[PDB]
Amino acid sequence: ANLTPCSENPAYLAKSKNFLNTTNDPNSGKIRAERYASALCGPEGYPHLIVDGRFTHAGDFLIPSILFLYIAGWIGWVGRSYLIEIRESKNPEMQEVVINVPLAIKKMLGGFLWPLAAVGEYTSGKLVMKDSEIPTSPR
């Protein structure tokens, strides 16, 4: 790449001497200045992010990426299977307006098995409905 790393960039070394303290820790700008030294910067002194998929820069993109891909899937599974187990109790409308909070807490805790449960639901056929029994719109 044509971008200089932050360990030897002159503009970044000129800008790191006066990084502003964000939190109440008075040495937060200095520890940020040595944390961002591993990244690479352009001709302005700001840390760019290599996103190509190379694992030497995976900490820029891929390591938070799959981290979000856990949590979103967690939320999605907690939002999905809960609806299935309120498809009938006596009336789903009030159970969607007010929350059956022990059932919701049970799904919220048990949602960390979501990807194996996703392959299990995809293989059992109870994930994707058929293309004919779905209430489509008229052509």
Partner 1 sequence: KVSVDNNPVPTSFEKWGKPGHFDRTLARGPKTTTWIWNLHANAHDFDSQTSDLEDVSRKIFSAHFGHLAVVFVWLSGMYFHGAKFSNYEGWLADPTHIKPSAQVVWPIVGQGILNGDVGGGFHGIQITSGLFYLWRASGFTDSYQLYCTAIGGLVMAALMLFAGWFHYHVKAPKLEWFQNVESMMNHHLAGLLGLGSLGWAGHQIHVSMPINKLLDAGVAPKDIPLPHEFILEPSKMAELYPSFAQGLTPFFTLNWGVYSDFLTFKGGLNPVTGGLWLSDTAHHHLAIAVLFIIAGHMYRTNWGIGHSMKEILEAHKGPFTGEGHKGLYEILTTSWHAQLAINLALLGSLTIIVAQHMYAMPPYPYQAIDYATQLSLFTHHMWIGGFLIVGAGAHGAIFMVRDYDPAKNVNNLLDRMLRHRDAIISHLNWVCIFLGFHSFGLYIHNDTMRALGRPQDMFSDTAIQLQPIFAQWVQHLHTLAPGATAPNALATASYAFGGETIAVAGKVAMMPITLGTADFMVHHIHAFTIHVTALILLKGVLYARSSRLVPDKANLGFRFPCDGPGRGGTCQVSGWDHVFLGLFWMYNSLSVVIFHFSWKMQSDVWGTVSPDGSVTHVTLGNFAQSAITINGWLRDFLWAQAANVINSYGSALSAYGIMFLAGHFVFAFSLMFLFSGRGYWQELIESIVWAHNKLNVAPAIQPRALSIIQGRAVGVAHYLLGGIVTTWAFFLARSLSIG
Partner 2 sequence: DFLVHHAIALGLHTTALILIKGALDARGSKLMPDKKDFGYSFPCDGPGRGGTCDISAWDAFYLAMFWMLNTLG
Partner 3 sequence: ALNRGDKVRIKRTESYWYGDVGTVASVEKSGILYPVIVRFDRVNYNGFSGSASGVNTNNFAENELELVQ
Ligand X SMILES: CC1=C(/C=C/C(C)=C/C=C/C(C)=C\C=C\C=C(C)\C=C\C=C(C)\C=C\C2=C(C)CCCC2(C)C)C(C)(C)CCC1
CB-nearer residue toward ligand X: 51 or 67: 51
Helix (H), strand (E), coil (C) string for 17-61:
HHCCCCCCCCCHHHHHHHHCCCCEECCCCCEECCCCCCHHHCCCC
User: Which of 102, 138 has the CB closer to partner 2?
Assistant: 138
70 C-beta neighbours (distance < 10 Å), count = 12
48 binds ligand CLA (CB under 6 A): no
Q: 80 touches which of partner 3, ligand X, partner 2, none (CB within 5 to 8 A by kind)? A: ligand X
Residue 130 touches which of ligand X, partner 2, ligand CLA, none (Cβ within 5-8 Å per kind)? none
Residue 59 contact among partner 1, partner 2, ligand X, none, beta carbon within 5 to 8 Å by kind? none
Nearest-angstrom CA–CA distance, 83 and 81: 5
Stretch that binds partner 3, among 12-20, 33-41, 102-110, 130-138 (CB under 8 A): 130-138
| Residue 77 binding result from ligand X, partner 1, partner 3, none, given CB thresholds of 5 to 8 Å by partner type | ligand X
Contact residues for partner 2, defined by CB under 8 A: 137-139
Coil, helix or strand at residue 4: strand
Q: Which of 9, 68, 18, 14 is nearest to 39 (CA)?
A: 9
Dihedral sign for Cα atoms in the order 72, 63, 53, 5: positive
115 scored as a contact of ligand CLA (CB under 6 A): no
In contact, 65 and 73? CB cutoff 8 Å: no
Based on the shown chain and the rule CB under 8 A, indicate whether residue 133 belongs to the binding site for partner 3: yes
